[PDB]
């Protein structure tokens, strides 16, 4: 049986289309890793966390570069968010350190939930029970569509958040005016 994404390659044996974004795209065989505290559960939890962090980072850039910083943080004034971080750190550094320790407690608890959820079987990877509106209660076909839409928007936002870091740390302008610069440079 061949991979859908790479039809010249065989299907990776631990990927069977059960997870949401599974089209058999593992050419390096990384889903077969089972040694240094890392397996398919750990990589799926890492993918989903990289999905959700990058999804929030993209709209977190596009909120400030369109509507400005939040009130109490009007000292930013820079569209480059890699530089606007250091103006908030320059004036109100305690709230960033408030969030970074609040993340530190959340992430250390999530690291226990990952390794206890792997040893047992009562936790899907990336699952925290955070469904307060309750989309997962009915229409399992429509709930698997939301599981696939999270992965599809999250895999796209991974490139976008990594790009906005890198083309913010190299052009020092901001994402949306990097976009206008590219539009006038490559117009035909």
């Amino acid at each position: 049986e061949k991979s859908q994404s790479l039809p010249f390659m065989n299907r990776p044996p631990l990927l069977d289309g059960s997870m949401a974004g599974d089209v058999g795209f593992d050419p390096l065989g990384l889903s077969n890793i089972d040694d240094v505290g890392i397996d398919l559960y750990w990589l799926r939890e890492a993918e989903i966390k990289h999905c959700r962090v990058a999804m929030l980072a993209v709209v977190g850039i596009l909120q400030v570069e369109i509507f400005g910083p939040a009130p109490g943080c009007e000292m930013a004034t820079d569209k480059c968010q890699m530089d606007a971080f250091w103006q908030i750190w320059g004036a109100h550094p305690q709230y960033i350190a408030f969030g970074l320790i609040m993340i530190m407690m959340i992430e250390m608890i999530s690291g226990i939930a990952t390794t206890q959820g792997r040893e047992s079987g009562e936790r899907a990877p990336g699952d925290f029970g955070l469904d307060p509106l309750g989309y997962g209660k009915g229409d399992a076909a429509g709930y698997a569509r939301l599981q696939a839409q999270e992965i599809a928007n999250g895999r796209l936002a991974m490139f976008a958040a990594a790009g906005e870091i890198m083309q913010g740390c190299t052009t020092h302008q901001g994402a949306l005016e990097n976009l206008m610069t590219a539009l006038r440079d490559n117009s035909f």
Binding site: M108, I109, I112, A113, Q116, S120, E122, D127
Partner: protein, 174 residues
């Protein structure tokens, strides 16, 4: 199964029975320490910060003892510690805390290793006559109120003593 505070985590089973139970022990301190030692430490940490928050915000609201000693004068709640180690006030309270904590050390050892049957946090102190023949469900809601107001005061004192040093200003940050 399925701890309440962290529903993505299994239940730490040594928490069952004790009264402030939300299923919240992700670091599994209950699997290392006995839960009588941890509840006694939680209650004592909470009872100190209930007094410590109230004593910090009263001295910074200008409440002083009468007659005020002349070495007690010109002090806020931040500078009151170091000035009264010199005067001897802090050495006086440390004496009577050490008197109580030496007897509590006999009580904690007898609770853990001699099996006194003593509740953690219990010192027999009820002069005003609460829990007067009340049910076990009524002493448990009162024990829950002590721990949650205890747990709140520890974060409440931690704010009021950190923000006091960061500003050295008027009341609502000191």
């Amino acid at each position: 199964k399925k701890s309440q505070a962290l529903p993505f985590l299994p239940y730490p089973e040594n928490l069952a029975g004790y009264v402030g139970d939300a299923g919240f022990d992700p670091f599994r301190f209950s699997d290392f320490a006995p839960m009588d030692f941890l509840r006694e430490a939680e209650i004592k940490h909470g009872r100190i910060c209930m007094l410590a928050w109230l004593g910090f915000v009263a001295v910074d609201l200008g409440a002083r003892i009468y007659p005020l000693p002349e070495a007690y004068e010109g002090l806020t709640a931040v500078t009151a510690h170091d000035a009264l180690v010199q005067q001897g006030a802090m050495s006086q309270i440390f004496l009577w805390c050490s008197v109580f904590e030496a007897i509590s050390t006999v009580s904690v050892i007898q609770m853990l290793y001699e099996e006194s049957g003593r509740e953690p946090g219990y010192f027999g102190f009820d002069p005003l006559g609460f829990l007067n023949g009340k049910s076990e469900a009524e002493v448990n809601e009162m024990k829950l109120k002590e721990i949650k107001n205890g747990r709140l005061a520890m974060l409440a004192f931690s704010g009021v003593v950190t923000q006091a040093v960061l500003t050295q200003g008027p009341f609502p940050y000191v």
